[PDB]
């Protein structure tokens, strides 16, 4: 679990969005596993606008932060799950690191701000949904 809170927006994994997220929907994209809902309170986070390929993510299944080198956002094949059919997920960045399904929503940050959230994993890999190209989150 986990979300990004920026301005009057809440960014969550689309497969973990609640009834309240869908009732206050701003934008969603199944191919990216992202959903953004509106909030009444001002958020605590800020978004990186950079090309960093290293950073630190929070792993709830270890209660620890880990440093990572990750690939540039790209279209990657993701096996079928209870939430989606087998498909290509876009804007996904991979890194070597521990993750379990409940780790989705953990934030990946660099020195500039939030880069993305955990969205995929397995066999010593962890995949993050990028949010740096969503410029409208800042206005
Ligand atoms: C070890 O398993 C995981 N670890 C972290 C996050 C996720 C998994 N499991 S997953 O990649 O199969 N995943 C399951 C939930 C939906 C996700 C999606 N973005 O399509 C894909
Ligand atoms: Zn950066």
Do 38 and 75 sit in the same domain of this protein? Answer: no
Q: Is 56 within 8 Å of 95 (Cβ atoms)?
A: no
Q: Is 115 within 8 Å of 108 (Cβ atoms)?
A: yes
Do 72 and 33 sit in the same domain of this protein? Answer: no
Do 22 and 61 sit in the same domain of this protein? Answer: no
Q: Which residues pair with 23 in a beta bridge?
A: none
Range(s) of the domain holding residue 55: 45-139
Q: Sign (positive/negative) of CA torsion 97, 100, 15, 114?
A: negative
Q: Which residues are annotated as a binding site for Zn(2+)?
A: 50, 52, 110, 112
Task: Say how many Å lie between the CA of residue 81 and the centre of ligand 1.
Answer: 8
The residue from 21, 103, 104, 130 that is catalytic is 104
The technique by which this structure was obtained is X-ray
Do 91 and 73 sit in the same domain of this protein? Answer: yes
Do 127 and 138 sit in the same domain of this protein? Answer: yes
Do 133 and 81 sit in the same domain of this protein? Answer: yes
If we measure between CA atoms, which residue out of 95, 48, 94, 93 comes closest to residue 68?
95
If we measure between CA atoms, which residue out of 41, 11, 6 comes closest to residue 118?
11
Query: How many CB atoms lie under 10 A from the CB of residue 38?
Result: 13
Output the residue whose Cα is nearest ligand 1's atom 13: 120
Q: 76 CB less than 6 Å from ligand 1? A: no
Do 16 and 64 sit in the same domain of this protein? Answer: no
- Residue 138: phi and psi, rounded to 5, are -85, 0
Give the whole-angstrom CA distance, residue 57 versus residue 118. 8
Map the chain to HEC letters. Answer: CCCEEECCEEEEEHHHCCHHHHHCEEEEEHHHCEEEEECCCCCCCCECCCCCCEEEEEECCCCEEEEEEECCCEEEEECCCCCCCCEEEEEEEEEECCCCHHHCCCEEEECCEEEEEEEEEECCEEEEEECCCCHHHHC
If we measure between CA atoms, which residue out of 46, 47, 44, 26 comes closest to residue 36?
26
Give the whole-angstrom CA distance, residue 72 versus residue 7. 26
Do 123 and 73 sit in the same domain of this protein? Answer: yes
Do 68 and 121 sit in the same domain of this protein? Answer: yes
Q: Give the C-alpha distances (Å, rounded to integers) separating 49 from 8, 20, 39, 99, 104.
A: 18, 29, 22, 25, 22
Q: 81 CB less than 6 Å from ligand 1? A: yes
Dihedral angle at the C-alpha atoms of 5, 99, 58, 92, nearest 10 degrees? Answer: -50
Do 93 and 128 sit in the same domain of this protein? Answer: yes
Do 21 and 79 sit in the same domain of this protein? Answer: no
Residue 38 contacts by C-beta under 8 Å, 6 or more apart in sequence? 8, 9, 10, 24, 26
Q: How far is CA 69 from the centre of its chain?
A: 16
Domain count, the chain: 2
Q: 100 CB less than 6 Å from ligand 1? A: yes
Name the resolution in angstroms. 1.4
């Amino acid at each position: 679990s986990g979300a990004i809170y920026v301005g009057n927006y809440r960014v969550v994994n689309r497969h973990l969005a609640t009834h309240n997220d869908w009732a206050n929907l701003v934008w969603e994209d199944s191919s990216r596993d992202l959903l953004v809902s509106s909030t009444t309170a001002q958020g605590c986070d800020t978004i990186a606008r950079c090309d960093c390929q290293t950073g630190v993510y929070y792993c709830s299944s270890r209660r620890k932060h880990y440093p990572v080198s990750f690939s540039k956002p790209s279209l990657i094949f993701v096996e079928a799950s209870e939430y989606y059919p087998a498909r290509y997920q876009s804007h996904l960045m991979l890194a070597v690191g521990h993750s379990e399904p409940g780790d989705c929503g953990g934030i990946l940050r660099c020195q500039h701000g939030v880069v993305g959230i955990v969205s995929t994993g397995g066999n010593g890999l962890v995949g993050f949904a990028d949010v740096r190209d969503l410029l409208w989150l800042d206005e």
